[PDB]
């Protein structure tokens, strides 16, 4: 049972901008996604202070970066608060309509695409490097869902079964054929060190066979 949804016109327009604009500094997508994980981890961290049972779905708060050269995927996984189905449908928990407007206004006032995170829509920077993005998420007391989109105006949502996560979000980037540098260990390490070096949770870069 796969449900198909239309992006709001403003989000479709943001995605088309990200896909079509000539913009060489694509590596900022990873900072944006790690920032989103850090925010999600802060949320579960705060909820747990008054309700420790919120960590029954896993106490460890951290981020994993998993490259897979066979599948041409880079996956960013966190054990943050996760998203409900309604959050996924509502622009993955973002204020993307107003954020898109602000980002567009900023761009005409001298901003560039690397400032996208300032407008709360950094997730969509994934489309600088990915042809398809799959988001698997599990929030306490909701079921596990998979969102997916290859842009083009629409996204799908379905329940995800097998490979349960205890809690959090996994962003699976199916990379564009010419963006495979982002599976190389030395390149990912460089980007994490350049742009994510003060994130307050462990970031483990997985090794490949
Ligand atoms: Cl909004
Ligand atoms: Mg912030």
């Amino acid at each position: 049972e796969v449900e198909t949804f239309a992006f709001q016109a403003e989000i479709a327009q943001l995605m088309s901008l990200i896909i079509n604009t000539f913009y060489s500094n694509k590596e900022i997508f990873l900072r944006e996604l790690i920032s989103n994980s850090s925010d999600a981890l802060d949320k579960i961290r705060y909820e747990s202070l008054t309700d420790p049972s919120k960590l029954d779905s896993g106490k460890e708060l951290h981020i994993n970066l998993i490259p897979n050269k066979q599948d041409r995927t880079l996956t960013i996984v966190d054990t943050g608060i996760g998203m409900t189905k309604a959050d996924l449908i509502n622009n993955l928990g973002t204020i993307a309509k107003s954020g898109t407007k602000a980002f567009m206004e900023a761009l005409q006032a001298g901003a560039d695409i690397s400032m996208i995170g300032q407008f709360g829509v950094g997730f969509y920077s994934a489309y600088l490097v990915a042809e398809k993005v799959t988001v698997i998420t599990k929030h306490n007391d909701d079921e596990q869902y998979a969102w997916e989109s290859s842009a083009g105006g629409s996204f799908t949502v379905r329940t995800d079964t097998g490979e349960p996560m205890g809690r959090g979000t996994k962003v699976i980037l199916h990379l564009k054929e010419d963006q495979t540098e982002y599976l190389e260990e030395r390149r990912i390490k460089e980007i994490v060190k350049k742009h994510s070096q003060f994130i307050g949770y462990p970031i483990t870069l997985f090794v490949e066979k």
Side-chain angles (χ1 to χ4, degrees), residues 95-99:
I95 49 148
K97 184 177 153 161
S98 62

Side-chain angles (χ1 to χ4, degrees), residues 137-176 178-193 195-196:
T137 189
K138 175 65 172 77
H139 192 280
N140 289 330
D141 326 296
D142 199 355
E143 277 188 288
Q144 186 163 309
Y145 294 104
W147 174 104
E148 186 163 71
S149 181
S150 302
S154 67
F155 64 90
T156 60
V157 176
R158 54 171 173 82
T159 68
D160 190 41
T161 52
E163 263 169 301
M165 331 164 55
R167 183 196 62 252
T169 295
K170 307 194 292 185
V171 178
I172 307 171
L173 306 176
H174 305 263
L175 299 177
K176 292 175 213 194
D178 59 354
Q179 300 296 329
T180 66
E181 65 194 79
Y182 301 107
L183 303 172
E184 300 176 34
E185 183 177 28
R186 58 206 329 202
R187 180 69 171 118
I188 294 163
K189 280 185 192 324
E190 170 186 54
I191 294 163
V192 170
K193 178 169 172 175
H195 292 296
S196 299

